Amino acid sequence: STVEQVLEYVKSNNVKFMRFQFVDILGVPKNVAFPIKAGEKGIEELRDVLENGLYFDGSSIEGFVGINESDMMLKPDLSTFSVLPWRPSEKSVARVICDVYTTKGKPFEGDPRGCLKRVMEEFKKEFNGEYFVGPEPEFFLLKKDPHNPHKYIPADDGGYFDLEPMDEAPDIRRDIVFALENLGFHVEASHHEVAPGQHEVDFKFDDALKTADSVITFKTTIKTIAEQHGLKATFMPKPFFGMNGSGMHCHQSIWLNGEPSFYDENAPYQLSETCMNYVAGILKHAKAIVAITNPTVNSYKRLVPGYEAPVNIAWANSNRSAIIRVPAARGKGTRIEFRAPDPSCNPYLAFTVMLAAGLDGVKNKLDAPEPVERNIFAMSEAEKKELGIESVPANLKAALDELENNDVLKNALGKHIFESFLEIKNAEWDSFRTSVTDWETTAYLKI
Amino acid sequence: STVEQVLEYVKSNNVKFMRFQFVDILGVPKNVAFPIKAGEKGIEELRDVLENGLYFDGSSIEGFVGINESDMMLKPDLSTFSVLPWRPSEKSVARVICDVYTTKGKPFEGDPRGCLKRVMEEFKKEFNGEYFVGPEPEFFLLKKDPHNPHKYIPADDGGYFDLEPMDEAPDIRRDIVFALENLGFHVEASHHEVAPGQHEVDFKFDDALKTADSVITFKTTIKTIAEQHGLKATFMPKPFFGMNGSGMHCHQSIWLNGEPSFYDENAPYQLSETCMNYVAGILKHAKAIVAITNPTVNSYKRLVPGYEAPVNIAWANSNRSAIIRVPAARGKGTRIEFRAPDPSCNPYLAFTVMLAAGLDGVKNKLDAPEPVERNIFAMSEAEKKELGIESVPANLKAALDELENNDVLKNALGKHIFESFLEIKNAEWDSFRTSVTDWETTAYLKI
Amino acid sequence: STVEQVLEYVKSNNVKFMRFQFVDILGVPKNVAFPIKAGEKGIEELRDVLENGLYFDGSSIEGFVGINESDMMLKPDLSTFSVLPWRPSEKSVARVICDVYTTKGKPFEGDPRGCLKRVMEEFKKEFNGEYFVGPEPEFFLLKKDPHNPHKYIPADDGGYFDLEPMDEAPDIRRDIVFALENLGFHVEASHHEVAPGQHEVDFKFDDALKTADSVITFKTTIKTIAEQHGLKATFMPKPFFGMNGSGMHCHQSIWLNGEPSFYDENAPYQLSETCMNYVAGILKHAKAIVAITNPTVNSYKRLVPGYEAPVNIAWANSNRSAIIRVPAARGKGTRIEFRAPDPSCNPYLAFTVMLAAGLDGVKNKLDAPEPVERNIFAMSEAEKKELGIESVPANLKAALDELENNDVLKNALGKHIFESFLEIKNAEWDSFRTSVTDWETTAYLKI
Ligand SMILES: [Tb+3]
Ligand SMILES: [Tb+3]
Ligand SMILES: [Tb+3]
Ligand SMILES: [Tb+3]
Ligand SMILES: [Tb+3]
Ligand SMILES: [Tb+3]
Ligand SMILES: [Tb+3]
Ligand SMILES: [Tb+3]
Ligand SMILES: [Tb+3]
Ligand SMILES: [Tb+3]
Ligand SMILES: [Tb+3]
Ligand SMILES: [Tb+3]
Ligand SMILES: [Tb+3]
Ligand SMILES: [Tb+3]
Ligand SMILES: [Tb+3]
Ligand SMILES: [Tb+3]
Ligand SMILES: [Tb+3]
Ligand SMILES: [Tb+3]
Ligand SMILES: [Tb+3]
């Protein structure tokens, strides 16, 4: 959308209120709103903000600590302008996703959106490279427990691909897809997942920045649609013990000079050296990547040993027990699926680190290990050690320490985000590790 | 419908969401849904999926364990395309029943729908044979027990063919019939059944595959209509002790070269040798057939001795105490009624095994025993032994063991479904056998 | 008490029931009881059991797995014979603490009591050494929350050394002291502790085996006295966040050839080389010792940074921020206080490992570091590193891994207890680490 197209939309729909939206380091969306003043002057005052941005106090935004927090700037990305996706019939209100800039007019180093844009621009400028991601976020719908109102339980008792009445959210999944599709946030399959009250909405395999914006919009929209139905939607990775957690498998590829670089008709499995170097890079840096793609203490309750748990650092052409699975599609569709991520991650940061790790593999021409097709949960600890299969960190603190020692990720995220993320997350881990949990009370009050 | 007819429907109705439906081994319907993209590009993408199919992960579908579960395919049967039968006024959504295929473009051996199609196609190719089934599924409508909200009781106190007000579901039966008829899922008689809250909807005597699709559609639709009325519909075979269970008598016949092969104007009872060989085949294999037509532990609480219980392996022209009853209709309508099946069966598998057993009788020219008109329950054990009247298995495990030793059924179902069904059902039996039931607590807590 | 003294007590008090008590690897007391038969024959049958022991099935005792579990033996220690300490007016019942033996008549390697006896006997035989321990166990008294009956809260709102009515347990502390003192389980100071509902009962500085028996008796007795008052006593180390946890400081010393070996009138601080070598041994092995002295996941919620937390591996003559504090008493009373232990430990195992670590220091003539008087919580991370001050493990798993790599402790505990303890505790850690905690639900359900 061009400035002129936005101004004409504003005039035709009599837009009276505009939201400027951005994201904090933890991936929480944020927005400040302003009235649209009447008259060509108001249209001129809006053009000025749309082209040059608006000032805001970022001192209370998580991860935005720095000099001049009280006069930071929001620079609108007009490609994202639209009616609110979660209130699409209220044409008098609109929003635009923005990048964060400093008072000086330069991208703010602590901006997660600007971070992904930076690494993608560098890849485009240096290698004429494009980066595509197709994520598969899962989530649970919850209702208040009838026996205890203070607690939430899964909204239904349905299962994988189930139909109503066991599946109690076919209209909700349909409605979120309509809300996103209607405004260009392209999505693919939707269905009830394995666990009671669990669901999935797949996203189009697309430009990583568009994908990240689609994911942040989807998270707000599904939560508002759930509330209209008296339910709560959660992206907590493992809300209930004894049932599946929620993951966000990320299909991804890189194209160099307009060609699907991962494809080589004549190579083993039809996977190019570039695809293998990229896979090698993801595997090499996997222990550090998960600090960002699985950034909660609860993320590690899903990343626990099991038949399909994506905790084993290996790749496969069919094995779901590996952290990377390569779909059978070839040609333009050749891509790799990172299965470790969960939907609690900040998509802008998760996509940045996967690209940086894969590109480090390409840059250093890293050799990939042999694929592992044998189910890895079922093999012994000795068989794993013999095959050199390492696991991802067992908890958030272990992942943070791996990230702290990873210079490739530090360069990708930049010092501000890397240090702010480590500081906030070490404090989060400290809060959890000093707490007295219900597990402990149940296990030890009798001693 | 043809590919063009489906595309015209999508364009006219501006269909924005499409469900691809299939069935698992236990007969539970499954579906994944996708948005219909805008304009010509979207019509072309939809044409491709309609003609060539779409990939899905079958790893979480019961009975679908094979190489590359993550990339299996759904191939739409356009003869089944329509608005959702249970949401007929929402024209922006549609569904299509699909066959399950492998990544190689071949029917998946574990697909129950493809299974019935395979046996029917083989019969058509080798003998120019057609197979027709007219099932009579019964079901209960339930309401919460006002004394105990956690329990369900029959929805009314009405009886066989009763009128309102004792019959509290005349509008529900009328509405399910209209929902199915309106979309070509042909149905016939509907009425309140013998037990409180029990009902029946009879299906057109038709091509067995169309019949199975109609039954699978009816089960979802009646459950959604019941919920709209604050009730629950159940196909549990024997939900309440002391009252009738729910059966699914299956009328069936085979026609060879366009002729009603079961009819012979000059033979005894006007029943042809082909009819008698088919009847002999069903009777010979009955103990194994019930493992599929009666696949639940609870199915054997309906298959218990009684005046009208279809547990006696015999046939008759009027006796309701026999497992096979031959209706009086002759000519084109000549057919046999297998009375053992209950609505918990997977119709695709039940129809497959009845045809295979009957065709084994035709192939081997098996002699049928004499019909038994005398009430079998009323006669002594010695009279039954003298007449050679055996009984169907007494419980699910006994039926599974009979199926395991039946090569005719193994060939009909194919190794994948045969072994998967036996494994799943033996685990279901174990769960029941090791449980501590309410009956045991009531009988033994005092000892 | 001699066999004859026990038999005469049995005859005079008409004892009709006798309990044989022992302890499992986790420090949980266990007992089997038998009737005393009438007549000299019954007195003779009792003499036989008192001298030669009785058989029992130890297959269901935690840490007793091995060959012939169903015919293990309990060998009574007549020095421990008495009326039940928690039912002292019921003279017709008595108990005796027993050591665990194998069917062959040799001490069972998995017995915690026999373990402490073994290390103490070896020390006596080789060096004419005696080992004394004076523990200070703290505990909380709990009442049901009025708002939520399913939860427990501190029994009162009193504080350190408080008097009634703020202190609501002066009669309970008095009554436990009377119960123990009356039967020779010597105790010293008793008082309300810092936290609401928290209390302390100090034990006489005595022979380590007598002390361990006194501690196990005290734990059962305070729990029964609490129940008589409608309360619950717990030794959980950190039952409530935001208030002090419960510790069990252990004063200890060794005497060689009847002399207080830790005392040297002419040495710095009047502490002998033997005392310094012992202190050096405790400090060297501290990371592994805490796996046994702090054997619960919750133990590490008390072992967290704080002004007085005993987490810093250092010793001091006055600093409470160090893991070892040396009381000012000299001469016969010269001793060292290990502050890390909590009352969840198995006293027999805790006393065994502290002695073995200290004796390893004496054996190798280990040099002790300089004492640290400066408050260690208040100093920087750099000041600590410069002074070489290490901390104890941050969680149970970290402590288990330290214990697994400690051969001194493995020799002290013996292979059976060392491996059984590691196995049980790694499974306990696994249960905690895969659980979904209330902390996680509170922190992430909103994401
Ligand atoms: Tb730029
Ligand atoms: Tb359920
Ligand atoms: Tb999924
Ligand atoms: Tb494309
Ligand atoms: Tb490594
Ligand atoms: Tb800071
Ligand atoms: Tb064919
Ligand atoms: Tb009635
Ligand atoms: Tb009927
Ligand atoms: Tb017809
Ligand atoms: Tb004819
Ligand atoms: Tb037989
Ligand atoms: Tb299997
Ligand atoms: Tb000895
Ligand atoms: Tb208070
Ligand atoms: Tb104290
Ligand atoms: Tb003394
Ligand atoms: Tb060290
Ligand atoms: Tb073991």
Residue numbers in the entry:
A (entry chain A), B (entry chain B), C (entry chain A): 2 to 38, 39A, 40 to 448
Reported in the publication:
Glutamine synthetases (GS) catalyze the ATP-dependent ammonium assimilation, the initial step of nitrogen acquisition that must be under tight control to fit cellular needs. The dodecamer is organized as two stacked hexameric rings, and each polypeptide is organized into two parts, a shorter N-terminal domain (β-Grasp fold) and the remaining C-terminal domain. Two loops in the active center are critical for catalysis: the Glu-flap, involved in shielding the active site during catalysis and deprotonating the intermediate product, and the Asp-50’ loop, which binds and deprotonates ammonium.
GS from Methanothermococcus thermolithotrophicus is inactive in its resting state and switched on by 2-oxoglutarate, a sensor of cellular nitrogen deficiency. The structure of MtGS in its resting state was solved by using the diffraction data obtained by Engilberge et al.. The MtGS structure presents the typical homo-dodecameric architecture as seen in other structural homologs, with a monomeric unit divided into N-ter (1-111) and C-ter (112-448) domains. In the apo structure, water molecules replace 2OG in a pocket with a similar volume and slightly open to the solvent. In the resting state, the ATP would clash with the Phe206 and would not bind without displacing the β-sheet 10 (residues 199-205) and the following loop (206-209). In the resting state, the loop 318-325 is constrained by a network of hydrogen bonds and salt bridges from the Asp50ʹ-loop, the side chain of the Arg321 itself being sequestered by Glu70ʹ. In the resting state of MtGS without 2OG or the glutamine feedback-inhibited BsGS, the Glu-flap and the catalytic arginine are locked in an unproductive conformation by the Asp50ʹ-loop.
